[PDB]
Amino acid sequence: HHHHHHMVHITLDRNTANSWLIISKDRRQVRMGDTHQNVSDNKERFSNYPMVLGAQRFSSGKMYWEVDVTQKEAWDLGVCRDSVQRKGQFSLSPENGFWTIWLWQDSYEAGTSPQTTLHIQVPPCQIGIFVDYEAGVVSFYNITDHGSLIYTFSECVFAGPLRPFFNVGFNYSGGNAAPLKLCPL
Template sequence: VCFLTLDPNTANTQLILSEENRSVTGVEEKQSYPDHPDRFDVCQVLCRESVCGRCYWEIECSGDDVLISVSYKSISRKGWGDECEFGCNDQSWSLDCSLDSYSITHNNILTELAVDDDDYINRVGVSDDDDEDDDDDDYINRVGVSDDDDDEDEDDDDDDDYIYRIGVYVDESAGTLSFYSVSRNTMSLIHTEQITFTQPLYPGFYVGSGSSVKLC
């Protein structure tokens, strides 16, 4: 398992890093960060460490405005065009997890993904205390969502309570990038992308206001 930290010099001014740069939260108010050539104008952040060889990491996400990405360090930082946004260029790949579907974007081409419920492998180290009543149709695992939430009248609150864990695996020699949905002692394959690596890859995240990402 790779140990990763977020690079504060890349963090957009509407992102707040915490937990020794292992967690990021999107906020509406701009922060007074110093100017830096590596800082994104888009609400994105890159990790300090690259991933090479064979590397696996997990992320816990809260909220529905998160993109889980890997990117070359050469991605543009200034401006709001496709050249800067994760998944919208040939420098990056991005997984979007909504309440009922997945999609992956690379070079501005979005592909909707189907999840095979039978595609599970054993996962060691995920808590057995997670809710055992998850619906099989819920491809992303909601952890810690209160049963007291108003299911029909509080859509915004439902989005805030939407918590899930994703695993990412890079195999440089095989040229693969894989995403997994992690739950309890299992994880299910979401998608494997074939990549011809031309540079080291860096994990990164787009995080909108009210959403957050934590490196596990």
């Protein structure tokens, strides 16, 4: 792919984070804490899952960023509507305003309804995310495997401003403590 030149500098929005997340001072890394991180509750925070949004809002153009997932067992990544539900249980689907992929139990899947099996020969350590707002496209790339395509959502109906979306996953196993990191441009 030749999307690197649409690179954007993403930072995480503390105010949207689940109350157990720890966001680094530079707002470029997030991990699961072992307890509540001593913040007040607010209507923006994801309550049920270890999720957080980027601060940036996109309503036009082409955007590209990269995320480091090294040594994680579980995570979700992509974009979502600014108006997605924050509280209670929900599925990651385009009907609910999410365009995402994930790792779970040694398999990679795209957040369609129902979910789609991904075919990855080289487990990725870094994921590239490309959004073309006007075209209605969200694509995922395997940076570890020379940028190979993972998945394309096309005919997307964004229906609002988009925000970068992250889920660090639970750490019931003790094997999923590692952070998500936004990689330098």
